[PDB]
Symmetry: C2
Subunit: 269 residues, 2 copies
């Protein structure tokens, strides 16, 4: 259903997100080769990939992650880590929508996450633009898992439209706001956002559509189970805003599913 | 380089060992189907397997585990859980011997795995005698990962001799005694020991061959990496008390390889 080529990119950014959690990237220097504990990012390891700037608890929300240069894949990857302790971070999630208009008219975006990027935007936007300058032939991708995901999406739609495309790969990201917004992220150019989800991952269930939230389109939904290897013949395009048969199926959800996107993610052996 | 039937048994007992850490298994009413959280033990979930005796923290060594009635596989399984933090248990690992002539004359063992077992030995011997009575033709199998492995092994060697074979499958087990214990465990009667190791796993290399400890033979080595699916082709039979060319290689150990035996084990998603 999804192309071998999209499958590799999905896999690779899953590893870049997982690397945000695992091995020597929580804080660190510049130029460092990227490596992960417990085989958590082999495809990144296999690439000529190097740190550009590493961050932590940046601004009001606690923003942690890195900016990488991948000479093999021709990339500049900004990766946002999610929470240190997920189950905590889960129950505490305020269903609250602050209007997004700067980013788009009539739109609505989650106060916690919406407020979280602004906190840091200028100090990193800068650091990206700089890299863009050095390798203007390189594709800018922002990725992230969980809280890291949400950030990426917010950093992305935000910082888009200054001349350089911004792809986003989110793995197990939650809703960031409203049906207008959703429609925005769906047709907004200069970056194709790829919202990846798994089975009944609890994160992209929240917040609910019952609370006026919605998700952008399409959604990429991994139907293979937890700990199960992923093949490109297990990933389905759920095109149509909030179409069902997706992470939005009617049924009951789970956390171990949040930790399995292609490989182990948001935790570290 | 092992048979298929052998592979399935490896895999089922890895799940059975996993379950000892994960699921609603830690204490539940007898007769309830055995289950786990985070896709830990699906082949055990597939079977008609219920708990017989549930325990945890019992013993003078906080010994944790379960006895399990498997109608589908026609087995009686006794499963021992490892430490809750394999690190604070690797770190704190005391290597002092003790006499174990009850098991085998001359043999000396780790005062720790011996004593925690000795304390639960009567009470658990009894409970297996009831299921063996209840099911004379069922296979008694003792299993465990990490510490669990070790205990299981020290149980097997000890309870063999009552008129029923006791097979042992340990996963990433530590070395358990001197050269006398080994040989007893390499050629002893009344049940086969299947000692499974993965790559550069750490615990099977402890305690050192230079604190008076040695390995039972044979060894079934898993060559596939951490977070990599296991095939019959990725297991290799390593022959010989303390042989090398498997796990017992002069290289640098790895905690995460210990946490992957056919699937996730030693931790829960």
């Amino acid at each position: 259903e999804v192309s071998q080529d999209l499958f590799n990119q999905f896999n690779l950014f899953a590893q870049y997100s997982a690397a945000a959690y695992c091995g020597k990237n929580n804080d660190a220097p510049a130029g460092t080769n990227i490596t992960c504990t417990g085989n958590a990012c082999p495809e990144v390891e296999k690439a000529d990939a190097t740190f550009l700037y590493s961050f932590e608890d940046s601004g009001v929300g606690d923003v942690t992650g890195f900016l990488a240069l991948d000479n093999t894949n021709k990339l500049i990857v900004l990766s946002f880590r999610g929470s240190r302790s997920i189950e905590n971070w889960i129950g505490n999630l305020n269903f609250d929508l602050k209007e997004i208009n700067d980013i788009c008219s009539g739109c609505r975006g989650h106060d916690g996450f919406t407020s979280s990027w602004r906190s840091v935007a200028d100090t990193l936007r800068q650091k990206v633009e700089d890299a863009v300058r050095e390798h203007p032939d390189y594709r800018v991708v922002f990725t992230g898992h969980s809280l890291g995901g949400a950030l990426a999406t917010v950093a992305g739609a935000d910082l888009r439209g200054n001349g350089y495309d911004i792809d986003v790969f989110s793995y197990g990201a939650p809703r960031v706001g409203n049906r207008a917004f959703a429609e925005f992220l769906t047709v907004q150019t200069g970056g194709t956002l790829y919202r990846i989800t798994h089975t009944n991952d609890i994160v992209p269930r929240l917040p609910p559509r019952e609370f006026g939230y919605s998700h952008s389109s399409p959604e990429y939904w991994i139907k293979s189970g937890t700990l199960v290897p992923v093949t490109r013949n297990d990933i389905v395009k759920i095109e149509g805003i909030d179409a069902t048969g997706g992470n939005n199926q009617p049924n009951i959800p789970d956390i171990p599913a949040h930790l399995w996107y292609f490989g182990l993610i948001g935790t570290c052996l």
